[PDB]
Ligand binder design. Structure first.
Ligand SMILES: CC(=O)N[C@@H]1[C@@H](O)[C@H](O)[C@@H](CO)O[C@@H]1O
Ligand SMILES: CC(=O)N[C@@H]1[C@@H](O)[C@H](O)[C@@H](CO)O[C@@H]1O
Ligand SMILES: CC(=O)N[C@@H]1[C@@H](O)[C@H](O)[C@@H](CO)O[C@@H]1O
Ligand SMILES: CC(=O)N[C@@H]1[C@@H](O)[C@H](O)[C@@H](CO)O[C@@H]1O
Ligand SMILES: [Ca+2]
Ligand SMILES: [Ca+2]
Ligand SMILES: [Ca+2]
Ligand SMILES: [Ca+2]
Lengths: 387, 387, 387, 387
């Protein structure tokens, strides 16, 4: 049966640790894939950790990291949450150097984008087999979320970007059922930029907190309705949650346009709590180091900067990286609301470290009705490796 | 229940990437089988990659490649499509140095040929256990497809060759149900040669594009009816699709006899599109390098050379090799037609490279109603290995 | 359906060997986790071996053992009883440096405690996903059993300790259903100390033989009723079963308070046999070496020292360590009583051996209506390793 | 449901190759258990290869072979037929240095004998958990088949020997249901010796061809009725099938007592074909080298030496070893008779080779209504290994 992800996001006071793979520590001797983007998505039976692979293994010359991100080897694979992205427990998903995945209640739908920069192709898989395709409509590195997509009552939605990573790019919302594209939509967001959206279902709609890699230090936001009508802008919150970014004091929030002159960025996430918001972010305003998660009152609908809670998951002396959102299906939590959870990728090796390779580990957190103490569940690997 | 592979082959405009195992890159450090013929076949629940093993692992002295192809160690094993042919996720199938496999909807039937050259034996397995046998009827290296066989409404069919690899050999069509041979047939094809057939169901019949290793650069073709009556000849298309071969301009197609003086050959495939044809082939007319797939209008029924489409899957600067056909069951694609898919083996090491071993990787493609851009999803391993 | 662990513990005359993983011997070359506390718990379908991991593998520099027990890497994982705690067959359970687990008949519930010493958090998982939380109520290293918890008719119970490891600490009994805490209780035990309880269901109640790390060489005992009412004290038996401890002759048993001036201790277990008792213990009164299991008549209700049986499972020339209790569900043994079983962890490496690492192996035993001969099923690894 | 192994053994004209694991070749680089006795037994869903392990892996110092056969580490484990006895696909069965296993249609029952020589214990497991026990009744190395046991209509039978390996020993037949011993029997066989019986169901009775390690070169035979009544003696056949042994010409068969002065022996098997017999044996009369299988007309009931067929499975230039019988359940072969199959262990390393270890590989064969050509499916590993 299809999954009713119709409920509202549970109001949480903190986040308890879900899992930790320790993929890299384990990689010092085991057979682990050098990965990237260990995002999480759950089926009504289990949560899995998806990731990208170059077909290389840590401590092997193939992890030479000199291989382009968008290479002809990159593939999306997966394991159960917590297990390392090891070769022997891995499930193949799709050829891809950019992907997204979600379960609709019956089968897994995955979307692997591969091919050339000017004419890439995103293959949609359903039940472990390709079912539909999407060709680059703008001929400039077609890409997607790199985190869980969202299925609601049988139809799954996800956001895709095609165009430059600086100036205006083009953004679209896609909708499928059983691996078959049944609807799409162009997003008008002039002056705004959208990349690597972190979504989740909430009150029958799909909410996403994305990344503005053009000129915004605050995160773009777009609420998608099942008929592909939508709203889009920025996390109102008067606090910047991207990286790099400026100081909170020198930031005036905006629900409309991007604020801050910073241009780069990093994938992040955020959860609506009624009118409040849980927003994640690197602790360092300059580096992908540390990871904290703050709750701002009315931060979803107001240029508020009233911090109600601050929970540290990765101290600033440790590397972090991408982070994404996903939801615990009701059939797993046994709740009447959708438990909001997120994952935090922790990057090790190049460029901040002296190794010939680059990979990441992960730590997953989930809702919870209690305040959870600060701590650091960092990677832990001892670099460099035998190389 | 039995699988109704009664439908017609879907008319496709191009092929999207299905999977890539990167077995060899992974083999630099992981425990991977040195394989050969990573052909694909699907059950109504999943598609698997079958392959031959010498019981050796890449980067081990046993991959010494000096072992004869038809050795007493060669065995057929398998994994899910996309996973590498690694020891720990592998399923044993049958003792064999030549094989074929297909699922009828309930269980997997596999056919492993092993034993001596002058008195080989092909063991038929059903549900993971031997059920019937076929002894060399011509006493000269009994062999079969090396790619998926074909089941239609409970009965599975496959082609077998016994006799020299040059002059006339003898060819037969076999038919079984539940691993039990219930019918066979001698193929009259004087002057013609048949090897490593790549088949697939189409309109209730079994179509196969094979290999003429005697004197034809164009591929032999035989349509099998469920009562073992048949038609046989060559892909009409006025373009040669074997390797080696001559230039397209110096080739006059023929649906009847072989054209071209070339004698060797390589396993290939082809898909009927009404009257048109999708024919695969190495890009190089001399080497097993590169891989393209051309669509010729009326090429299935006419000595046509009207190229409607050309899609490159492996550029000519990269090694290729065998390639085979298979179909996506309806119960997986959710289609009303049989999605045509093929696999392309990519050989690395001896003889074209300086290593003491020889193995291959693979990339799988499937139907799709859209034009797919050219690109190259090549092996990627860095040779030589620690040896 | 829920598991009726309502029956009485079977009266056993000895213990037959259940399984042996040989994790460490295997670790000399395979990919095995450096573990700790390989406790066992069973579902109505199978028994699994749970354990703690630092994300390190034997013979790797990460097994450097210098990492704190309560590190941010420690995680609870598991495999089927007898299999080694190898990376490739492991199932992730929860982030933890102290844990407990039991199955209620439908799903697995696990409890991982992690976080900082003064504000640790114990995450309760149900069906492979976090469902509830317990925060340190006494702000001093919250911890639990390190052995199987106990489910009876749908509700699962376990004991937790928060406070110093010397002087008085605080002890609580928790009760959950479907991963949700539905009841708890404070244990009044002034002068008494409770740690690492080894429990099991018996006559509809939960019996536990724990560890007094403050001043008792005899083991504390507490019988929990389903309404969280309880009784607590010490194994009446006139023989000390902790380590370190004094000689049996210089020991006067007590069902009330601790006897013996010794302060440290080690996790142990014990089984009620009507009024008799099976109590395990290191053979050495000073070291965690050897392992024997004695049956004392009326030792559960009387300060008796009448040894009816003595069975050696690990000779005194071999290292032992922790040991815990668990029960064979009725649906597996086919019995009408709950077969009492225990596991014996065998520690190798630091501090008693010269290696840079420390890990353990295990051997599991179960009830049985017959006397079983003495023998030694010790670890067996040859130290040191390549390091 | 229970398995009706009531049918007769199929009349076969030869044996087709079922599987080959190549465990040792694979072990040169992969993680494989140094094993012994890779016997096969099938459930109504699959056939598995069981084996003994020292917890050691090939190419590791623990495979030092100096460890006693009956050590405290030896354990029975298993994988699916054809897969190598690798650590990562292995299933733990029972602590044992001698074992037997069979499936009754519902669950797997296994019997692991372990413990000391003068007081060994055989633990019976059912459904992956210990259910009953058998203690040495004669106090001198209790042991069993080392090959598949036999279940018929719910009750499983197996033979056990306790006593010296030379002079008279004591032999018993055991009968269980659901892992519970429900009947046993003493075998009167004065002057006769029984070891490592290879059994199989035939016409509602259990037939076994065993090993006389005292004074017979011909194999002892005992037909067990479901009520534990029985018949016992020797394979009538006028040809010796043990190793060592004398020449066929200098042998006068006997259905009664042992013939030949030779004393040692090796585990073998044999299949009744009405009145005829298929008997296996090393080709060399002196060494465990080569393996052939001869069919003697009326050899089961007459001192006949009329060889109807001779099929070689392992040439005399290659090492062999133990061999055992098992049957293909009807629910797998789809036959109306029980397909007779056997396995041939191939030993490599000490004592015949210069390595510090000793292990074996295997090749499985099954019934088949056709004559199968001679060939050799030998081990294949290249010795010595990195050591
Ligand atoms: C340890 C190692 O192999 N590092 C190599 C480095 O030597 C080389 O210059 C570079 C460019 O190909 O690739 C990797 O960085
Ligand atoms: C690296 C290696 O072992 N190569 C060997 C080569 O030395 C040898 O001459 C040949 C013939 O046996 O087999 C392999 O090619
Ligand atoms: C073999 C090895 O790496 N041992 C190291 C030792 O050298 C070092 O002094 C200590 C402190 O960091 O950690 C480990 O004991
Ligand atoms: C290569 C190796 O470690 N072989 C050892 C040998 O040196 C030793 O004398 C013997 C007795 O312990 O055991 C093994 O045979
Ligand atoms: Ca930015
Ligand atoms: Ca040719
Ligand atoms: Ca103590
Ligand atoms: Ca003998």
């Amino acid at each position: 049966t299809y999954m009713n992800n119709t409920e509202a996001i549970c109001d949480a006071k903190g986040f308890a640790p879900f899992s930790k793979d320790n993929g890299i520590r384990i990689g010092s001797r085991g057979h682990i894939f050098v990965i990237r983007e260990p995002f999480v998505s759950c089926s009504p039976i289990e949560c899995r950790t998806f990731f990208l692979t170059q077909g290389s293994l840590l401590n092997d010359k193939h992890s030479n990291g000199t291989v382009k991100d968008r290479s002809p080897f990159r593939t999306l694979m997966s394991v159960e949450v917590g297990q390392s992205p090891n070769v022997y427990q891995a499930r193949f998903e799709a050829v891809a150097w950019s992907a997204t995945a979600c379960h609709d209640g019956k089968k897994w739908m995955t979307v692997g984008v591969t091919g050339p920069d000017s004419k890439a192709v995103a293959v949609i898989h359903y039940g472990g087999v390709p079912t539909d395709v999407v060709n680059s409509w703008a001929g400039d590195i077609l890409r997607t979320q790199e985190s869980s997509c969202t299925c609601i009552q049988g139809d799954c939605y996800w956001v895709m970007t095609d165009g430059p990573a600086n100036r205006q790019a083009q953004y679209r919302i896609y909708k499928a059922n059983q691996g078959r594209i049944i609807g799409q939509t162009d997003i008008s967001f002039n002056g705004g930029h959208i990349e690597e959206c972190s979504c989740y279902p909430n009150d029958g709609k799909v909410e996403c907190v994305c990344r503005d890699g053009w000129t915004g230090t605050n995160r773009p936001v777009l609420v998608i309705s099942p008929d592909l009508s939508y709203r889009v802008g920025y996390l109102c919150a008067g606090i910047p949650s991207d990286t790099p970014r400026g100081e909170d004091t020198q930031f005036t929030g905006s629900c409309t346009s991007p604020m801050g002159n910073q241009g780069y960025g990093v994938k992040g996430f955020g959860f609506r709590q009624g009118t409040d918001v849980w927003m994640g972010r690197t602790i360092s305003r300059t580096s992908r180091s540390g990871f904290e998660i703050l709750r701002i009152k009315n931060g979803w609908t107001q240029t508020s900067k009233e911090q109600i809670r601050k929970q540290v998951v990765v101290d600033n002396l440790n590397w972090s990286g991408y982070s994404g959102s996903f939801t615990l299906p009701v059939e797993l939590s046994g709740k009447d609301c959708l438990v909001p959870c997120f994952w935090v990728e922790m990057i090790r090796g190049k460029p901040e470290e002296k190794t010939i390779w680059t990979s990441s580990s992960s730590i997953v957190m989930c809702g919870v009705d209690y305040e959870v103490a600060d701590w650091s569940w960092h990677d832990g690997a001892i670099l460099p490796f035998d190389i």
